Amino acid sequence: SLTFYPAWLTVSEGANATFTCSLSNWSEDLMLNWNRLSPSNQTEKQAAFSNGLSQPVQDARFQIIQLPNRHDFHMNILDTRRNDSGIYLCGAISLHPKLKIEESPGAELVVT
């Protein structure tokens, strides 16, 4: 199970926004995806954590930081823009021993 909070976060444009993705059973083989939702409710990967490091898809302002306790992660939108406003969620992909997609509930970013 994954949780993703705060459920609703606002900040001024130009400022960082930090959400937490918290996993109940993290292991190092998992891939953790930071996703945005489109209006039709399609998921769109922003960044991915795998093999020790986070990497953005096209904007490095989307930054995943693993916390010292390892099952929790900071998903940071750095230097926010009004356009960053929407719903986000984190998701874990497991390949072994069973294929699994696990998604958290959405949280909302409101950039003012």
Binding site: M31, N33, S40, N41, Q42, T43, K45, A48, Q55, P56, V57, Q58, G91, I93, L95, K98, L99, I101
Partner: protein, 208 residues
């Protein structure tokens, strides 16, 4: 960075037809089957598990015994195409495709299923021969819910009673009681939405 795309977020398909839903992914040079994983699922039900370059018919759920397959020929073109045959109302929902090919990503596909009201069964019964009251019935099944409108030769709207139950296909049945004559023509029209669809039947009053 590796990304999966979808041409369509949303499929609207006719009941009992065949469904091909697609997830697109980058494939530069010839397909390396060893590295490729394809996973299709629905409501935590395993549909397709394409691993080490071959479908594992073991880990698949029984609901998709014969009806589900992945189109291998398409993979060499970067198309994870899932064909589902004889689509039923239970097949509506949200599908997820997950592809690992040097990176991994997943996308959601929404499936909506229509069933047209075209098999329209009818019946005409004489209720009282003196005043020539007849009972006219029109029954049909489909999805979603249709209302039924009665019209006469004049196309002047009439007043019937309509009962809607389940089969969850909706079974819609409508009765008109009316005094009429031999050769009078009546129409029953099933009006459904999602999208709009008006399906008519005709009932002609027979000799007494």
């Amino acid at each position: 960075m590796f990304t999966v795309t979808v041409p369509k977020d949303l499929y609207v398909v006719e009941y009992g037809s065949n469904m091909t839903i697609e997830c697109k992914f980058p494939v530069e040079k010839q397909l390396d089957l060893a590295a490729l994983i394809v996973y299709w699922e629905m409501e935590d039900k395993n549909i397709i598990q394409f691993v080490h370059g071959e479908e594992d018919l073991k880990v698949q759920h029984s609901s998709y015994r014969q009806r589900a397959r992945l189109l291998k020929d398409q993979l060499s073109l970067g198309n994870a195409a899932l064909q589902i045959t004889d689509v039923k109302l239970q097949d509506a929902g949200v599908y997820r495709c997950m592809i690992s090919y040097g990176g991994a990503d997943y996308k959601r596909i929404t499936v909506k299923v229509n069933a047209p009201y075209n098999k329209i069964n009818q019946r005409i019964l004489v209720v009282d021969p003196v005043t020539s009251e007849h009972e006219l019935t029109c029954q049909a099944e489909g999805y979603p819910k249709a209302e039924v409108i009665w019209t006469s030769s004049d196309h002047q709207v009439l007043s019937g009673k309509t009962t809607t139950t389940n089969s969850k296909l909706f079974n819609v049945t409508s009765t008109l009681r009316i005094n009429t004559t031999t050769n009078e023509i009546f129409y029953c029209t099933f009006r459904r939405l999602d999208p709009e669809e008006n399906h008519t039947a005709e009932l002609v009053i027979p000799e007494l």
